[PDB]
Design a binder for this molecule. Structure first.
Ligand SMILES: [Cl-]
Ligand SMILES: [Cl-]
Ligand SMILES: [Mg+2]
Ligand SMILES: [Mg+2]
Ligand SMILES: [Mg+2]
Length: 295
């Protein structure tokens, strides 16, 4: 169902000097839910209940996000894709996950998740993705509605727009959810970024990482790598498509549709589809996991 209560209380693990937060309920092999920008584990709160009894349900808060500690020093060079991956690889190792992990990913959680899988292909039982960054794109491929704003985030206008005005949290997020959010729900997304300044840096560093028209070249090479791999990998996949959708449309959707061993469903939503169709999403993930773990 919908609802504002969190799925569980946060547990903590020390990683490289910083305390990182995560939800961990139940027992069995892991079903790993990873959020992107500008969200936290809270994004999966109404989707995780659907998998009760199917495994150890885990949702990690990326460094500087949710209830995980903020990095200090912080600035334009902080929270890049490679730094996020360093902290996440370590937390995932600390959790003692084993070799039958089902990944459930979104937005930057999908770029981090697709890359971890390319690198640990034997420990991945299945991948469920939605509104993902599945390959490098052109501006011609970006959604028309926010093309100018994201070109601005990538320019020097980014700092005023995000660190000062908090535009990614206050405008982009609600603007890409079809239904209106309650105050408790908006408060849970706002919580880690209440303070002006560097506490909001993660939400600005992320749009500057998207691989478009060949820049930034380093993330473009990483995406080109996991795109080529996925288009040929036999691992079971679940493509949760959306209409109207946002990122995974046009050429990118045509490409994802060529991937092997994949099941597809379409749900209502723009970009943050977990807030519009949580039960349809959770039900498909549960069904996908029951096929992978026959009881
Ligand atoms: Cl972004
Ligand atoms: Cl570059
Ligand atoms: Mg400490
Ligand atoms: Mg805090
Ligand atoms: Mg298009």
């Amino acid at each position: 169902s919908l609802g504002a209560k969190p799925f569980g209380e946060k547990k903590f693990i020390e990683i490289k000097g910083r305390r990182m937060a995560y939800i961990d309920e139940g027992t069995g092999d892991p079903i790993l839910f990873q959020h992107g920008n500008p969200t936290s584990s809270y994004l999966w709160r109404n989707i995780m209940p659907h998998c009760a009894g199917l495994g150890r349900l885990i949702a990690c808060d990326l460094i500087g996000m949710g209830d995980s500690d903020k990095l200090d020093p912080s600035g334009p060079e902080r929270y890049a894709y490679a730094e996020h991956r360093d902290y996440l690889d370590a937390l995932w190792e600390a959790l003692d996950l084993g070799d039958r992990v089902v990944l459930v990913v979104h937005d930057w959680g999908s770029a981090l998740g697709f890359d971890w899988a390319r690198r640990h292909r034997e420990r991945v039982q299945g991948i469920a993705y939605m509104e993902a960054i599945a390959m490098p794109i052109e501006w011609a491929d970006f959604p028309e509605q926010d093309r100018d704003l994201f070109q601005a985030f990538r320019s020097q206008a980014g700092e005023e727009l995000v660190l000062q005005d908090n535009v990614f949290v206050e405008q982009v997020l609600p603007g890409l959810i079809l239904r209106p959010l309650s105050e408790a729900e908006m408060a849970a997304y706002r919580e880690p970024f209440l303070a002006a300044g560097e506490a909001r840096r993660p939400t600005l560093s992320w749009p500057r990482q998207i691989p478009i028209a060949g820049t930034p070249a380093d993330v473009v090479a990483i995406a080109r790598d996991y795109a080529g791999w996925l288009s040929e990998s036999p691992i079971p996949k679940l493509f949760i498509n959306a209409e109207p959708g946002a990122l995974t449309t046009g050429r990118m959707r045509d490409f994802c549709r060529t991937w092997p061993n994949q099941t597809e469903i379409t749900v209502a939503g723009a970009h943050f589809i977990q807030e519009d169709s949580p039960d349809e999403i959770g039900a498909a993930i549960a069904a996908f996991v029951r096929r992978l773990r026959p009881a």
